[PDB]
């Protein structure tokens, strides 16, 4: 016979709060008061602290029963939500220590602008290729998803196009601009990216979102689409354009290399590898970014298999094509001070080079 | 509870809207009105947007009880239907965002030709074949289902056959003509492209179309029927002829590669590669056709692997067999100005030679 | 039907009686005494020796309806648990010779720390790392617990993070100090290490304790978490640095091991190599450890494949770095008189340099 | 409407007939009367032949309804049982043209001792070893369960630890002397090695018994325990120290091959082979050892993968160290007289220099 | 509905008939009257043809509920059993045609001798051996079964041992003579080989028919048998001793077969292999059999991995040993008359010796 804190708050009461007060984050666990996170500090709300019960009633508050029995059965949850004239919400529900715990966050109605997240122009001019294969890459935290939602927002306020999305999780939400926009969300729209690419050529789509690019059947439809006139975006978690195409390539049997480099050669319109790395400032993270866009001659490249080569052509590139290679980018970042020596040549897959470029 | 939008439109309305304005495709999506694709573009009806009930009940009218039952398992259906005195169509059912969506296509009872696909002679001359292995390789999406269509209704109309197609989905449907044809959608009437094979020969067809040649197993069944006096037509993912007869031999047990050279060798009447470009305009799509026609020369190449070589005998291929090579046809579309350098070059799997034959 | 013995003590009893003694472990089996272990030391209680029905009972008694259900399925279980004015406890019940058996663990309020493990400021200093993967390995039972414990709960007072650990089992317990804190154990708040790991992005940590990088999977997941600004705490039973990053690479594809090579050089803060060795008395244990920071000149030779030259480094880096080897480590007991030359001439991974060492 | 045999003993008679003529095996299966083995020697019983309704009854008798269950499912059965006042004992219960059949197994109170087993002293030493791994070896049946109780009683004897056995099955039982031991047996007391063993660090052991050394997961297990202080006894179906140690090395990936043959040269502190060879007489058995026990020298040739050459150290360590190979063993054998030239150049994996010993 | 024929005899009839007219084989089959074999020829019995309903009430006349259960799941059902008086038989049990259909055999009381199987001495003084394996090849239907059988009855005839035998299926039965006998058949008194000799070893054998060495398992529990001082008699489906020594081998990965080699060296005491040839007359069968007997000179062969090798001590082995090639089988059979020069080349392994023994 236990019961809820004194007049305890209600979940409506602490996403209100977590919202006015600009925050990101709202942390639901034990003998802790609620918490929330604004701009990356973690900060107590001044309430007493939760016990399990408190816990269990504010995270079920949020789910629908078929969620709840979901959640006992597994004890994992993950879930979107909106609260109405609030916002739209990710929620993520576990067991701790045998009590409920939830992590619940903000999902915006703006999307960041290519200005915004200080993405240079080639970025914004890969938004309008008509057709092919864009590949946006890099650790899962590195700001791909923030790339990808600028990218998509700019189709969809240019195109009159079909855009479908498959997310793991969807990270940002597009409201229809001029193109209608599906978004599945694997693991509750769909029961996977299997799935829900059996049937993309049936959904009359013209943008496809693949959300990251785990196996051979996947690649595939990645590649299948790029072919047929679609703009498919796609996602590795790699950190090199050269990484990248190798991958692509590598995991396939010996004998169909050939063909899928060919297939690359063809439908390739652009690789950008990301890393968020720490501001000198230490409270704060900063994009490098690695930009590889498809000439005559790297397109000849991939199809001969010399795909180490294509390196030399992005060191020469940036100005007439948008082509910056890591350390290029590293490099630039020092000039400005915004990362610190030792980040930089940490990050660097080639210390030897970057310290060339900074004897200037 | 909610109630779906005041004095809301039926899918027969919506779908005699579709045909009547000559569209292609009609989309059901929440917070958007129902939008039809008219010769490419997306184009919103007269009416208010959609809500999740709407969606739903829309979707769900043109279901039967099974088909629902196991879209709620499933979270993903796709089916064939007919609306009588209007139209057959596909539609695709899906979740996203926890709301039901639909894509509805329509499928012509008129089947496009040879002179309209631009398909060149040597294909109606393939379509008049009446035994052995026939193969329309490229993308999904390339149109393999269209060069297939012809192909089956030149045969519905010229022969007194037993016609049976294996497909997935069915995207062209074909009364009987002269032939009696029967097709089996893998999903619907068939489980599997194994199941529907395992008895393909204890159904006395004449004619089978037996779709994507995924295993060991569906190309040991198109091969012994091409063996033994049927038309085999079937498909591969492959972007040439070389290409997709390294293929048919390469899945294979090193021990069975001799035998199965030796059966491609024998029993191989063509060989189709497509690839549907851009127009220069964008805005439309063109094709571009590799075809391979087996003579002594080059049934010899394959069966004592020399695969590579056949390449050398479709460049001189033209007049006698019809025979054209990738770069010829692509050569081909920028004479009639149809396709730009650009792409035309990125799809080339010869840069060099495509140049040299555009210097003459 | 039998009794249980007269008058028989009850758990609360028994443990209160285990905690007052300074006692560590609980036994209850059959036809012993409970016994409890002091410093080391087996002692049977003043009381008769325990039946069948006796251990059953007792076992029984710190159990939840679900746990013994568990239990008879499985013939295993084990918990935490706590008895309030008393403390926390680990409980493990199995059956042996058709009989239920209990061993029961305090777990202590007091978390030991660097100077009272005998640990060197250095793995202080790693402590106060922002980011990146930090690594102890060694043997379960060589004190990695102990030494993450620590680590954890440094972090704890001195930072205002949320630290999320995943555990087979939790070993120490932490109370919120500055930081929030989730611990899920594996068999318990979560199925596996793969359930946890698969929302660990989504659960908003800045500090997580991965447990033991079992599979591709997990490895992938920690270095993900280091490559994106989080501090990642995670183990393998490995006895040396060398030795562990070559494992890291190793269980990889070929194809994906110069990229795997790339994030370690990057993202790698520290790797710490335990054992614990018998003292020269041997009613004890002392702690070698081997400790490997890295410079430099070290993520050169993890990304450009020079591995075994790392331990060169080491040999090195004492006063600037605070590395250490584990020959290093070694002859420093033996020094202190800590250990016997038997004893650390078997550890060695390279007696004749030991005997070089111990020459000068 | 079949009965028992008129006046028909129960198995309480029989297993008292059994013990008391010193019988170690008790035969019931139909055709013939009840049979006793005492000292080798089958003997029937002066009883009417068993029918088919005896045997069950019989078996029965001493089983459980949740034994008869799983012995009706599997028509499989083993198991431990204790009658009151005379024995505990093995069974099998099994079919046989379609009947039941037992075989029944005198469980002795009394453990025989090195000095009965005519094991050599260093075995004895051994069972001193405060820690490590110790390996007895060789085919099930050859007397490596009364040389593994033999160990344990003494270790029960005079020490004051925990000592955990896992066995497949029991074959000796172990009242509680000066240890408290805890006798687990797979497939009755845990489903398996994998699952006792998952739990055997959370038990607080000293000294554990591991059955055999199957796979993977049990070796590293085991290895692990005499990593971190504990005496490690286990068990392989191999014929010599050096066939022992490089089995161990070998079922690894070769990456992990260096790390296991450094813990091996670490922990391991005794090999012994067994086996059992019939005496001259033809009527009896004699065993054969083979003695390996770690020196530096040894560890050095472990660790540097130089294993073969061990051999030679057993070869001139008897005196000082107590090894002896299995050659020298043989030799001894014929010596006293206990063996046949024509059994030990049999079992002589070198005949050749057992020949040259000979020769003196 | 359709009835059984008039008068239609049952099956006590029927068998009656087949014992008393010395067959060996009854046919239960539709359109056809019983047919019996005699002495090799198949006979009609002076009845009407047998409708489906006969088959199906004759069939299940001979069975148990569980059978006609077990029938009816899986349209296959082998058996043994008894007619009181009269005889045991064999019974299968099978569909053709949707009808059920019967063959029944009959298994003699009285065991052939190995004078009237003519085998050579030397299998007699095999029998007489005490321990070890004893391997007896060929395929199944080349006289395995009763060479066996042969062995076994002498055995059960001379000792006092438990004699255990897993048959697929018991061919020949064996009442207790001297020893106790135990037979299990696998299918239907134990689940699988795997399962019955899983506690062999707990069931106090000393002789063991362990029947056809399929597994790794399985061949590891017969030289764990052989090894422990029992006698293991085994089958395998090889034709001569070097191809069946390989065999032991070859099927265990690299690293163990150095043991298995040094294993079987030590406790292999024979091998046979069998052929049953046409003899000249074609309406008969006369035995080819190969044996090889270890010796010192064989068993270093063996263990040191020159087994081909072999084959030259069999050439020789004769007078001493009473080994015998498979060529030297042909030519005495060709001496003699009994099969042909055309069956004897072809079933020579190396006919050019064969014709250079034929010429002296």
């Given at each position: 016979l236990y019961f809820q804190s004194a007049s305890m708050a209600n979940m409506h009461q602490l996403l209100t709060e977590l919202v006015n007060r600009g925050g990101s984050d709202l942390h639901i666990t034990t003998n802790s008061p609620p918490q929330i996170r604004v701009d990356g500090q973690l900060i107590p709300l001044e309430m007493?602290?939760?016990?399990?019960?408190?816990?269990?009633?504010?995270?079920?508050?949020?789910?629908?029963?078929?969620?709840?029995h979901?959640?006992?059965?597994?004890?994992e949850l993950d879930l979107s939500f909106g609260i109405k004239g609030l916002s739209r919400f990710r929620g993520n529900v576990?067991?701790?220590?045998?009590?409920?715990?939830?992590?619940?966050r903000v999902i915006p109605y703006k999307i960041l602008t290519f200005e915004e997240l200080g993405l240079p122009v080639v970025v914004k001019e890969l938004a309008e290729k008509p057709r092919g294969l864009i590949l946006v890459t890099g650790p899962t935290g590195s700001g791909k998803s923030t790339t990808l939602a600028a990218i998509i927002d700019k189709i969809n306020t240019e195109?009159?196009?079909?855009?479908?999305?498959?997310?793991?999780?969807?990270?940002?939400?597009?409201?229809?601009?001029?193109?209608?926009?599906?978004?599945?969300?694997?693991?509750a729209d769909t029961k996977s990216f299997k799935n829900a690419l059996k049937y993309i050529l049936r959904q009359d789509?013209?943008?496809?979102?693949?959300?990251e690019l785990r196996d051979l059947e996947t690649i595939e439809a990645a590649l299948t689409l790029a072919e047929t006139g679609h703009l498919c975006l796609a996602t590795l978690h790699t950190n090199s354009a050269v990484q990248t195409i190798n991958r692509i390539v590598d995991v396939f049997p010996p004998y169909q290399q050939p063909q899928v480099r060919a297939q690359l050669s063809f439908v390739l319109e652009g690789v950008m590898s990301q890393t968020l790395l720490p501001n000198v400032s230490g409270k704060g993270r900063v994009l490098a970014l690695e930009v590889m866009v498809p000439n005559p001659a790297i397109r000849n490249l991939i199809r001969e298999d010399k795909i180490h080569q294509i390196y030399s052509q992005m060191q020469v590139g940036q100005e007439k094509f948008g082509m910056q290679t890591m350390n290029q980018s590293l490099f630039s970042l020092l000039q400005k001070r915004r990362i610190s020596l030792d980040v930089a040549m940490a990050r660097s897959s080639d210390p030897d080079e970057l310290k060339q470029m900074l004897a200037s």
């Open positions: 007493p602290p939760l016990n399990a019960v408190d816990t269990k009633q504010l995270c079920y508050s949020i789910l629908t029963e078929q969620q709840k979901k959640f006992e059965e597994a004890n576990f067991i701790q220590r045998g009590a409920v715990a939830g992590v619940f195109r009159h196009d079909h855009i479908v999305t498959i997310e793991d999780p969807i990270e940002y939400l597009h409201p229809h601009k001029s193109c209608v926009v599906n978004q599945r969300e694997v693991g789509p013209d943008v496809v979102l693949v959300g």
